[PDB]
Amino acid sequence: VLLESEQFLTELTRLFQKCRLSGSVFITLKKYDGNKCLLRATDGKKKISTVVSSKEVNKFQMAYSNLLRANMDGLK
Amino acid sequence: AQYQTWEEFSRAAEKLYLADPMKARVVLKYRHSDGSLCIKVTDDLVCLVYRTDQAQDVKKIEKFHSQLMRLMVA
């Protein structure tokens, strides 16, 4: 599911809540043209993806780094 | 392969990227049930992974994740 850079963040929020009891959430980042970069996330059941260009990278990492640090809480 | 330390996995994975930027990929696996994290930077020629949740690594792990994102786009 290739989404917009905004819809991607709300669906990536639910993948961290859906597997909050059990499950893994993968995030595969890769170079892509056919500059831009490809980001994909899959808990195993539902796939989401987006393409992030130089036009919206600054806008992305900010909301993206906040979502990651918040929904990732492991060991002490 | 599994550089279960720091600043040695980062410098090797970054050199994997500068070697061939088109083929390299980085995955980020989170497992909240058991409470662990997993980074991997594979390059179609080699393979480097990093376990050890240790939440003091959560910040340095996603900055490494968000830093590679600016190199794909420059």
Per-position DSSP letters for B42-71, written without gaps between them: E-SS-EEEE---TGGGHHHHHHHHHHHHHH
Report yes or no: A34 at the B interface, CB cutoff 8 Å. no
- Sheet with A47-53: list strands edge to edge: A47-53, A36-42, A24-32, B25-31, B36-42, B47-50
Q: Taking CB atoms and an 8 Å limit, are A52 and B73 in contact across chains?
A: yes
Element (H, E) at B28: strand B25-31
Contact A23 B33 (CB under 8 A): yes
Q: Is A66 on the interface with B (CB under 8 A)?
A: no
A41 neighbors A67 (Cβ within 8 angstroms): no
User: Would you state the structure tokens that stand for residue B41, as one six-digit string?
Assistant: 């930077």
Structure token digits, residue B14: 């970054």
Question: Which residue in the block uniquely carries the two structure tokens 């480097």?
Answer: B48
Distance from CA of B10 to the nearest CA of A (A): 16
* Experimental approach taken: cryo-EM
At residue A69, the 3 state secondary structure works out as helix
Is residue A45 within 8 angstroms of chain B, CB to CB?
A: no
**Is the CB of B53 less than 8 angstroms away from the CB of A74?**
yes
